[PDB]
Amino acid sequence: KNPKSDKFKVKRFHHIEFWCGDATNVARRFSWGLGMRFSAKSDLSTGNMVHASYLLTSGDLRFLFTAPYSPSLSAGEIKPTTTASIPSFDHGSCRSFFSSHGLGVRAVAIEVEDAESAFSISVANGAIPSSPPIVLNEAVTIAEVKLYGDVVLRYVSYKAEFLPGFERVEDASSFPLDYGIRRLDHAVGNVPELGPALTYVAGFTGFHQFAEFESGLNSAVLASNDEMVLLPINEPVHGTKRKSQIQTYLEHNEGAGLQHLALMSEDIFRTLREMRKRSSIGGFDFMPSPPPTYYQNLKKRVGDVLSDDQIKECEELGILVDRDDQGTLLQIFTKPLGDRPTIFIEIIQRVGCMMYQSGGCGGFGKGNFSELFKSIEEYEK
Amino acid sequence: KNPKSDKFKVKRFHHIEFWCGDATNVARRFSWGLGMRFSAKSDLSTGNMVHASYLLTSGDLRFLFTAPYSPSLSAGEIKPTTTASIPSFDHGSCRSFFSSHGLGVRAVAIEVEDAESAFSISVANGAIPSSPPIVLNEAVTIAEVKLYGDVVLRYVSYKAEFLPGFERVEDASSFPLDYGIRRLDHAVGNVPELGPALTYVAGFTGFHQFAEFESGLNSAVLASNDEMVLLPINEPVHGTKRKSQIQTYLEHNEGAGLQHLALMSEDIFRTLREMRKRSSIGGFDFMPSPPPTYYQNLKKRVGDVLSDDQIKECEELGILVDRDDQGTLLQIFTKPLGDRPTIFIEIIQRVGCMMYQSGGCGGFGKGNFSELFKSIEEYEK
Numbered sequence: 039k040n041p042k043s044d045k046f047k048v049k050r051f052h053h054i055e056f057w058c059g060d061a062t063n064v065a066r067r068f069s070w071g072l073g074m075r076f077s078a079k080s081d082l083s084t085g086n087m088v089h090a091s092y093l094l095t096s097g098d099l100r101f102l103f104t105a106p107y108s109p110s111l112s113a114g115e116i117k118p119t120t121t122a123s124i125p126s127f128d129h130g131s132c133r134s135f136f137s138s139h140g141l142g143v144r145a146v147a148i149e150v151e152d153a154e155s156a157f158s159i160s161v162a163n164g165a166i167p168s169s170p171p172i173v174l175n176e177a178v179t180i181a182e183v184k185l186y187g188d189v190v191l192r193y194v195s196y197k198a199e200f201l202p203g204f205e206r207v208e209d210a211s212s213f214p215l216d217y218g219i220r221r222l223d224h225a226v227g228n229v230p231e232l233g234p235a236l237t238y239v240a241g242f243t244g245f246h247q248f249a250e251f252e253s254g255l256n257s258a259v260l261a262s263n264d265e266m267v268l269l270p271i272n273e274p275v276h277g278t279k280r281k282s283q284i285q286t287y288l289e290h291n292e293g294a295g296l297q298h299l300a301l302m303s304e305d306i307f308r309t310l311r312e313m314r315k316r317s318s319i320g321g322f323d324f325m326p327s328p329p330p331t332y333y334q335n336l337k338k339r340v341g342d343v344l345s346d347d348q349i350k351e352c353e354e355l356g357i358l359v360d361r362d363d364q365g366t367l368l369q370i371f372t373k374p375l376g377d378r379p380t381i382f383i384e385i386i387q388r389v390g391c392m393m394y395q396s397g398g399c400g401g402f403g404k405g406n407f408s409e410l411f412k413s414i415e416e417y418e419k
Numbered sequence: 420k421n422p423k424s425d426k427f428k429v430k431r432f433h434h435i436e437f438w439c440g441d442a443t444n445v446a447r448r449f450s451w452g453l454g455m456r457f458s459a460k461s462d463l464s465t466g467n468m469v470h471a472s473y474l475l476t477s478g479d480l481r482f483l484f485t486a487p488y489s490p491s492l493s494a495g496e497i498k499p500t501t502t503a504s505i506p507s508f509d510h511g512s513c514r515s516f517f518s519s520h521g522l523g524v525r526a527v528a529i530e531v532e533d534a535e536s537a538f539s540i541s542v543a544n545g546a547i548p549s550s551p552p553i554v555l556n557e558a559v560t561i562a563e564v565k566l567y568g569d570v571v572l573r574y575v576s577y578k579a580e581f582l583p584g585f586e587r588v589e590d591a592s593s594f595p596l597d598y599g600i601r602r603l604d605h606a607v608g609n610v611p612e613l614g615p616a617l618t619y620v621a622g623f624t625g626f627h628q629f630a631e632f633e634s635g636l637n638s639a640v641l642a643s644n645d646e647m648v649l650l651p652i653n654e655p656v657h658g659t660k661r662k663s664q665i666q667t668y669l670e671h672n673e674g675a676g677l678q679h680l681a682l683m684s685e686d687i688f689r690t691l692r693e694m695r696k697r698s699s700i701g702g703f704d705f706m707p708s709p710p711p712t713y714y715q716n717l718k719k720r721v722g723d724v725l726s727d728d729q730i731k732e733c734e735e736l737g738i739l740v741d742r743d744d745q746g747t748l749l750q751i752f753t754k755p756l757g758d759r760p761t762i763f764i765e766i767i768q769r770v771g772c773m774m775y776q777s778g779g780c781g782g783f784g785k786g787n788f789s790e791l792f793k794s795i796e797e798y799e800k
């Protein structure tokens with residue numbers, strides 16, 4: 039069921055912006071850990087006296103890392119005379135965000151046909167405005183509305199190099215890392231109450247519910263017309279034996295926010311080999327692998343899609359596998375990206391649904407919860 | 420001239436503590452960039468509900484990275500019932516420090532015979548108290564006094580594993596990196612006025628002035644009895660043609676603070692090869708190399724100490740060389756460690772003065788300022 043009810047034309051995920059206290063160290067760590075190239079900058083060396091922003095790219099994936107300078111550097115400016123390249127930036131908002139939440143995503147940015155129209159229609163349909171539409175160098179238009187917590191949905195549209203005022207970084211510093219990651223597949227929020235969050239976001243976007251197929255989790259996925267923009271949201275289920283990890287998130291994050299980013303790889307094996315080689319030398323750690331029972335139970339479930347060698351290759355890398363009625367999903371989860379048990383990354387590869395590949399092919403791994411319970415108890419034997 | 424006037428017994432530099440917004444990403448970046456092993460932790464997994472602290476070690480060098488959790492996690496605690504492993508930590512102080520200064524050094528920590536005595540004698544001699552002496556698990560005593568800006572001099576003494584409450588990190592995560600760095604040689608402050616800063620610090624420590632031999636810099640070095648604890652301080656010289664980099668520091672740092680950390684390497688060539696290999700893949704960048712004239716002028720100055728091959732090896736790595744009347748100094752400087760043009764690192768190796776090697780052998784490279792001016796103009800030809 040796809041009513042295709044988008045209230046304005048949405049294209050693809052454009053970028054994800056992290057608000058940091060020091061953009062340099064987070065960007066360099068992520069670049070090495072994920073194999074993403076330094077591709078653009080806006081900072082003191084480009085005349086930005088307001089914020090330091092560094093863009094990493096891998097395929098179509100764009101990660102932006104931004105931190106405030108001392109307000110004193112820009113004390114003489116006013117909004118008409120700002121040197122910030124992202125006009126929505128606010129020193130106080132940024133410092134308040136990072137002291138409240140620590141390292142996390144401030145903006146989920148989607149590209150649209152007309153950012154001013156998208157903002158207007160959104161606000162007309164219940165969206166809480168965050169930053170009004172602003173036209174940068176007559177070329178790009180940016181506007182922001184509240185999504186959940188202190189996370190914003192950022193609309194970007196081009197009349198026709200990331201943003202104006204960003205410079206291409208010198209080749210020297212730019213080193214061509216690549217572990218196979220290619221695009222953002224979905225971005226997931228954690229909220230206290232799923233109902234009101236869904237009503238709000240579906241209300242101002244027109245995104246529809248993506249149909250799916252005791253873990254402390256209720257969730258639903260909002261999707262654009264071609265289901266390439268996927269925004270799942272989770273709520274906790276209280277009273278369970280093991281404490282809901284959504285509830286732990288809300289407590290350590292000081293409320294709602296972005297929980298995980300799913301990054302599509304063109305070869306999840308190459309990606310997981312390359313990231314795991316770097317786990318203990320500055321990269322990212324992965325959640326503990328499932329017990330070998332899990333992989334001894336995979337033949338009965340996906341033996342038609344993956345060979346005995348590829349299923350073996352799953353076991354060494356700790357990859358999980360799930361399956362829709364339309365496709366198959368390979369997935370694995372990092373440990374939290376920073377100090378707090380809040381944001382983490384998911385690496386995924388989807389197989390099936392070739393018409394190009396349709397969005398959400400194979401689902402989001404909801405069955406891997408139940409299979410992860412049956413794994414453990416069956417192994418305990 | 421060494422009066423040996425220490426007002427209490429000082430041993431060696433013990434550790435340097437960075438105050439961060441996310442300790443994880445800074446620690447992982449530094450570990451890869453400098454070849455330092457993850458060696459101890461105090462965080463949620465060890466019962467610390469207050470701050471996340473991660474210790475990197477290379478030889479005797481200890482770098483500690485600390486960031487606050489949400490105050491909500493520890494809202495029920497009081498100082499007698501704290502789960503912080505560093506009792507001086509304060510959420511508000513830490514957030515205020517990082518929003519004011521960005522990433523930087525909060526504590527220069529020296530080991531002493533008796534931290535309570537050192538604190539008492541210091542305060543009796545004009546030191547501004549920061550955190551009174553506290554005995555941790557009847558084993559270690561920590562106390563802090565103001566050094567300059569928001570940097571503290573931290574006294575640590577042991578009756579007899581970093582600090583109580585810190586756990587040894589699992590071997591898995593611990594990967595034995597090592598690029599040859601071995602100990603902290605000196606830690607340098609930038610202040611608006613050198614005179615009052617020196618009078619203050621020499622006043623409460625008894626440290627003496629270490630004798631030395633148009634760059635916008637006046638400086639002096641305070642030293643302990645055996646001159647193994649070296650604390651240089653700089654002030655700007657205004658009115659010069661090129662703006663004093665000390666003044667730029669003060670402006671971007673919002674006042675006085677730690678400018679650079681000099682790390683002694685047992686083989687500066689191995690270190691600089693290994694760090695430079697990683698500059699564009701998550702490590703540290705170095706200041707631009709001097710022009711080849713500089714190395715064409717080295718034979719006439721240090722040809723008695725370094726071979727033609729080692730002087731050639733200087734040129735490829737960009738190493739600078741200076742010389743006292745007692746020894747020779749090899750040195751090089753990183754670009755700033757984070758977003759702001761504030762803190763950076765110096766890598767050094769000293770040759771000469773073997774009695775063990777006496778402190779400050781070869782000086783601090785003050786002549787490399789003048790030789791760096793003569794380099795450029797002579798090259799311009």
Ligand SMILES: CCCSc1nnc2c(C(=O)Nc3nnnn3C)ccc(C(F)(F)F)n12
Binds near residue numbers: 224271283358384404
């Ligand atoms: C970090 C350890 C917690 S385990 C975890 N956390 N998330 C997930 C997802 C997921 O991606 N769900 C999802 N994506 N978009 N919408 N929704 C609901 C699938 C499977 C698992 C599994 F199998 F590991 F339990 N997850």
Ligand SMILES: CCCSc1nnc2c(C(=O)Nc3nnnn3C)ccc(C(F)(F)F)n12
Binds near residue numbers: 607653752765787791
């Ligand atoms: C980052 C680029 C600025 S150039 C710079 N910045 N610092 C230094 C030092 C130093 O270490 N001085 C020092 N150490 N302890 N006390 N003092 C005074 C020596 C030589 C140079 C040189 F040659 F590059 F100009 N430096």
Ligand SMILES: [Co+2]
Binds near residue numbers: 226
């Ligand atoms: Co997911």
Ligand SMILES: [Co+2]
Binds near residue numbers: 605607681765
């Ligand atoms: Co120095």
